Symmetry: D2
Subunit: 292 residues, 4 copies
């Protein structure tokens, strides 16, 4: 499933920074009960940067085992070297994931033609649906609508997570792709706007702690009930902003701990513990959302 509220799920850790199976179970149960459409496993919010390929595959496989067929799982699979992306994708072929979320190469700043060759090569070598991921503020490069148009002609490139926050991208892309290509926001604060312009859903950080409200917001949006959706969005807006008051996923992991969804808020370096001022901002946002 590639529409609606999709959670960019945390990778909960114990105090030593190893994956906490019990906490992950609790989250997956929460998303199944709360109507989340799908789970993105080991994306950005899942600390893809700091897990190696083996830990990464283990978390995706644990997620699939715990989901037990009840919710679809999408794996984070991007890399900044095309061979590495291909490699990582092969590990998931026939795993039971429904698709991959693959970020533009970071740090090396490829050209548009380089992005086109990168994602074309990845798609060629799997039968899994690929969702492109554009987030220039993190990567240093910006996959432009013209190149998305080119890539959308590849049979298994099926959509994009557009995290620029630049809402003009929705209809720039839409006009260049077919009606079945999925447009997903990657920017929780602008996501409702993104859906109102023609987007199909959101791959969300806020959904980690407000799963039911996110799922209902996205359904109302899909039905065209934007005024109703916006009431929900206004209650969630402080979270949409304050989950980034310190680097993601520092705030959202602390929030999940505060709600009791995970045992510890531990992260791996270079992520560091939430500051006291951040705890206060985040808990105020949680209370605005009605969650505490």
């Amino acid at each position: 499933m590639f529409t609606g509220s999709i959670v960019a799920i945390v990778t909960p850790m114990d105090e030593k920074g190893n994956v906490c199976r019990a906490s992950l179970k609790k989250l997956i149960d929460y998303h199944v009960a709360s109507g989340t459409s799908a789970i993105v496993s080991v994306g950005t919010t899942g600390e893809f940067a700091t897990l190696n390929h083996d830990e990464h595959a283990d978390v995706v496989m644990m997620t699939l085992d715990l989901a037990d067929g009840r919710i679809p799982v999408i794996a984070g699979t991007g890399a900044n070297a095309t061979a590495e992306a291909i490699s990582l994708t092969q590990r998931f072929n026939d795993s039971g994931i429904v698709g991959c979320l693959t970020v533009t190469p970071y740090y090396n700043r490829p050209s548009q033609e380089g992005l086109y060759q990168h994602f074309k090569a990845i798609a060629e070598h799997t039968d899994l649906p690929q969702i492109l991921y554009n987030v220039p503020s993190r990567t240093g490069c910006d996959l432009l609508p013209e190149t998305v148009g080119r890539l959308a002609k590849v049979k298994n490139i099926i959509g994009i997570k557009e995290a620029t926050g630049n809402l003009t991208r929705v209809n720039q892309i839409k006009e260049l792709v077919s009606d079945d290509f999925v447009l997903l926001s990657g920017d929780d604060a602008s996501a409702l706007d993104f859906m109102q312009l023609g987007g199909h859903g959101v791959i969300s950080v806020t959904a980690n702690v407000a799963a039911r409200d996110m799922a209902q917001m996205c359904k109302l949006a899909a039905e065209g009930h934007f005024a109703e959706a916006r009431v929900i969005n206004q209650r969630l807006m402080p979270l949409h902003n304050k989950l980034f008051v310190e680097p993601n996923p520092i705030p959202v992991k602390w929030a999940c701990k505060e709600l009791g969804l995970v045992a510890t808020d531990t992260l791996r370096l270079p992520m560091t513990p939430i500051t006291d001022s951040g705890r206060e901002t985040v808990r105020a946002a949680l209370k605005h959302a009605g969650l505490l």
Copy 2:
């Protein structure tokens, strides 16, 4: 060693995309003959992003072997996970490198406290000198002067490669650190200005192809002869700009090939071959510098 013209050396490849030992030897001999001060091996221009850690280590070790003590070698050792950076650095402990060039984590956008903890942990697990490297256009992170001050207190953090192109940073950093902390430019087009303000050298892309001119420019600067240095700078300014007409190191590899310094201009995806227009542009820049 950590002053003057330091080349950010290309990792020359064969047509298959693997290191070309004959080409590497030819470059290293060229830098020895030309008066280059040091070699940074497998930094950004060396394709750090697309070599695996074994491949990376092999290139460093080969470079050291071929240098044969004639020219000091600094290894690129950054990572966006602190554990990974510590592992990569440990590969080189007792190798013969003189220090490490370690980039701010990319993609995961840590806080300044995160950057402090990351670089301090790395510095604690080695005796090698550490050069911090700040290049926010690539990483999504900006290591601010205040934080560089805090880190400069760690015994083996000894300098910074400042690749913002923002020349105010020179004296902002200089006032927070001791007189022996080295300030190196990471932006060829502003590097002579950077030295004019107090910087000690440059880790240079241009020096791949204008090694003697860059070493002479930097000597003239260190001696206070800025007008004479500027004449050299003006001859090189089109290369300083046009070696980034397509993503680095696409242009500089082509230029190396055109000058007969390497056998092929092959790179790894997502870097792609230079365009025809790019070739013309770089060729004009080489003609301007008097190299072709």
Copy 3:
């Protein structure tokens, strides 16, 4: 009238840079026949910068006389000194204009509180409806949604022309103002998106040469027929971009000459004649729109 397609009309000039009454008549007749909602007289596109207060008032009065009750006229009235804005507004009180379009002070970069006092003072001293105008790329300051919310409580501050091109502003403002407050795009390339998010119309440059299509696009948008509107917008998109290929209103005046709507494309310094390359780009855009 403060909804639909509102034209930011050129001030047509003869070869000496004086207002050409015959050309202005022709434009006004064109807008009446083409279903334009209202005319903004001596706004940015009308060369407010280069007319003095007397020429400015004369053009607004000539526009009103030529309109002859058939189309509403809004006057550009902004200034960067609050006393000057008040002064200029008084000249129009009881002129027959329906409202004023008042830009944030330019060059002096006032605070939000300064913007609040500026526009509050202007509104206090007239009974005319005021439409606020935010265009940071020109002024150096950005009237933020919180301040718009404060100002919208003033009885005669009735709407905003939002020219940031940042579409998140639509619902940030909407949630802070009453349902009768008018939200108007000032960015033709994003205007349809702006209306789809809840905006009420556009104060448009493109409407100078595509009045009928703009009027129909905005009506379809108001009715919620966004797919139908978007077909029109895609035919107009090259104009929406290429009317800014050189500084506005250089392209649109040349376009109006090419269509025969005005006798000359003359402007006042520091605007200079369209380049040959600009003529070619603009005429290609006109042909894409079906206008030539």
Copy 4:
């Protein structure tokens, strides 16, 4: 005359918002005693935006009268319409000013060809020396080095106030102009760096309140004594930053009042009185500089 520390002098006002002659005399005497090189009258810091042209001229003429030949006076003379700039400049022909400071047109965002034609027309209608002034954060326009080169060929265009804060511009401009073209900083916080790179002085906000320190800093720079100059710079760096904690000249007027240099800190809307927090911040900066 056009080197060293040039003060961008405040236009001190009474409580009604009109020029305070006693205050103006007190400032001018202060600059004479302090070793300030020249006075820019009714530039940006002098509230050019909120004085009418008669008021502006009166302030210039009063300043000249009070200077009584003891200190040279440069008039602010910019406008965003070329005709208006020519008129304002003509008011001062034979006045006794030594030159004019003329800003790039603001708001109307002319092209580089437009900027060339605007400044060349102005220079053609006077015998007075013209200092170009580039401050894109205020104007929406950036006068690039190439264009400054073209303009430097006009006999009476003799320098530039470069207020981008982008220090690469120093040597970019210097290489395109003759040795007698004057380069002045318009950014106090980077001005010592700007002089280190080859600039000839600063048109300074800080010099309103630290005139002797700024003149001594600039003398030390001209002589090549940068380390000694930097000590002065470090003492002043909090003022250089915090005189813009609220929009200029809000902080610097308050500071002048607090030091007893002017009778009131009144400004004209849309500038508003300093906030309490701003007062505390500026006061701390004055204490750091040793002035309070």
